[PDB]
Design a protein around this nucleic acid. Structure first.
Ligand SMILES: Nc1ncnc2c1ncn2[C@@H]1O[C@H](C[C@@H](N)CC[C@H](N)C(=O)O)[C@@H](O)[C@H]1O
Ligand SMILES: Nc1ncnc2c1ncn2[C@@H]1O[C@H](C[C@@H](N)CC[C@H](N)C(=O)O)[C@@H](O)[C@H]1O
Lengths: 350, 331
DNA sequence: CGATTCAATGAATCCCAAG
DNA sequence: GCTTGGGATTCATTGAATC
């Protein structure tokens, strides 16, 4: 009953949370199974198989079975949460809307939805959808009548900080050395979250010494980040082999003192989308002997051939490479000007 | 249907008046709160989505956009009513409004949901190659960076104030329409507002049907859409998918004369050789079949594209047989 | 050694036209 | 509607293998 700074519990999160005292934790971070509902095998363009999340703990018979599970552990989570505490839940489109409805139905007050913008997600291989390049976190206090939840706005110096105050966080996947390897040399856990995501949650909505509960502990990512930042934690996980890796990982964590951005692309298609050029407009060269027509997707046409400003600009000169930004010009009131001016105009607004 | 249709009234009553399976795409920006209780909003949400699904064609899709206040309500009703989510989209606002209150994170995004009408109707419009071109030749992702609707695009009312509190940017609808419709498709917007969907639809050569209950918003929408310069249809072409090129069976390459029975095909390294058959099959020793089944068998692969795998001898060296398919398509 | 080329992989609801 | 099989499809990053 008298826990230490690190507590790892083997069992089902509903049963184990119900055994904890009520109003006992300052923050809850939940990474529940998403119930991806995958049909079958997916192959990369080189015919190699994707190691998909097909584990038994992500299989649910239906939406209704997932909703009953969701409302059950959320109710147990709300019981052990302190009155001035908060909960974080993460998901993708497969589940985050069902989690969010259950969060609101149980009396939580959603303060923000936070987007985890993945810099290096697995792409869409067949060309059937947009690349699923993000996940969604929900940050909610225990009630809208709650006294005062924790939000370290003045401590983190977030006043007018254009990157900290944003509700979208650009963070890479958990790969490389941080990705814990199992006994077979492969990944130990299929859905391990990057520690950098947990750092932003912990440092913004907890104080040193606070108790963080993770009812889906996995390989102990919440615990490793809490211990490194001077927070106490309680982890619950059903799988014993994940807990073996979590215990060995956390024992190697050295607590630090917590007080201790790539260039974005500007596609030509964005300039046409913004209306700075219209589809059907004409692009000229420096002299005006070569012309191209703008298409709605940022491609351009010369004769019967179409393509990007760089491929077509290279074809119109019979040259290997070409920088279409400096080669193509658009008519203004003062004559021809390179489309690179419009690229700098959109770039300055980003 | 008509290129431009604007209807004054309630979206549930009006959508029920339309014929079934008549619209290709639905874009919905519902109000956050119901009347200017979650139970009331959930019933309203379930009613207009159910009415929208009936009007949608079997191969159509729906877009909804909201904030954290209501998007979970809408997302659950979308899934529950039989829609199948393809993506949720994050509109990252390039220039978000600053939040100096210091109590929450600054609202720098909104969420969109793109879903086909049902799960097993997997034929839906998605112009993958056009959007890849639009994203500098890397495939378009679920995170979109688009500025807020500001400047002269923000429709002003009398006395100079903003006319609509939740007017969406045209560039956002431009990417929606560019990606999930074709020229000629009809787009239904049951929450028209000041006509953002219509202005973008008219620009890209799409029909639209707008429904809005406030007459003051419809006067602004009509005047705004009238000033939209429509792009000529010959300028609405985008990059196409190779899945829609005229199929040239390999049996036609042999019957034409570009390859003869007895010719040998090679892999990239030249270690896998196959002989051409009269009917278009190829043989590797005792194995015989199509250029795709044999190409996969000779390298122990589940699948293979024989057009890029097999090569025929030319004056410059090994050239893929896809070169010969291009010659047939050139004529 | 450094520079250049391969190989691997990540929460994924991932084909579609012809008969 | 179903089945069949042609043939289309990948981004960022890490770390080893090769030159
Ligand atoms: N009912 C349950 N009680 C406890 N743990 C569960 C239960 N159901 C699923 N789990 C586990 O929850 C974990 C879900 C993971 N997404 C968590 C990974 C964790 N965030 C990490 O970074 O390592 C899986 O390891 C499941 O085994
Ligand atoms: N029941 C209803 N039927 C039709 N329109 C409604 C209804 N309820 C609210 N509306 C309107 O729907 C609009 C919701 C807006 N968010 C849409 C704005 C629109 N996307 C724009 O860019 O202008 C508001 O103008 C509402 O007045």
């Amino acid at each position: 009953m008298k826990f230490g700074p690190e507590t790892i519990i083997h069992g089902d999160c509903i049963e184990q949370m119900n055994a904890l005292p009520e109003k006992s934790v300052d923050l809850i971070f939940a990474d529940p199974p998403y119930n991806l509902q995958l049909g079958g095998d997916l192959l990369r363009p080189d015919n190699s198989k994707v190691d998909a999340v097909d584990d038994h703990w992500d299989q649910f018979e239906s939406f209704a079975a997932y909703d009953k599970f969701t409302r059950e552990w959320l109710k147990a989570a709300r019981r052990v949460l302190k009155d001035d505490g908060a909960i974080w839940v993460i998901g993708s489109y497969h589940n985050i809307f069902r989690v969010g409805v259950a969060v609101q139905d149980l009396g939580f007050w959603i303060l923000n939805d936070i987007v985890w913008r993945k810099s290096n997600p697995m792409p869409n291989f067949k060309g059937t959808r947009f690349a699923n390049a993000h996940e969604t976190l929900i940050w909610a206090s225990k009630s809208q009548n709650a006294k005062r939840y924790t939000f370290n706005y003045d401590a983190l110096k977030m006043a007018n900080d254009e990157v900290q105050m944003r509700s979208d966080w650009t963070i890479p996947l958990c790969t490389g050395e941080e990705r814990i390897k199992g006994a077979d040399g492969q990944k130990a856990h299929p859905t391990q979250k990057p520690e950098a995501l947990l750092y932003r949650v912990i440092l913004s909505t907890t104080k040193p010494g606070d108790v963080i509960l993770d009812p889906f502990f996995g390989v102990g990512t919440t615990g490793a980040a809490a211990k490194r930042l001077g927070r106490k934690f309680i982890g619950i996980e059903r799988e014993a082999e994940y807990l073996e890796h979590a215990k060995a990982r956390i024992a190697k964590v050295v607590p630090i003192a917590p007080e201790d951005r790539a260039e974005p692309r500007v596609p030509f298609g964005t300039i046409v989308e913004a209306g700075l050029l219209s589809p059907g407009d004409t692009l000229y060269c420096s002299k005006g002997t070569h012309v191209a027509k703008v298409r709605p997707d940022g491609s351009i046409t010369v004769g019967d051939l179409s393509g990007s400003i760089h491929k077509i600009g290279a074809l119109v000169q019979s040259a290997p490479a070409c920088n279409g930004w400096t080669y193509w010009h658009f008519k203004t009131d003062a004559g021809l000007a390179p489309i690179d001016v419009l690229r700098a105009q959109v770039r300055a607004g980003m």
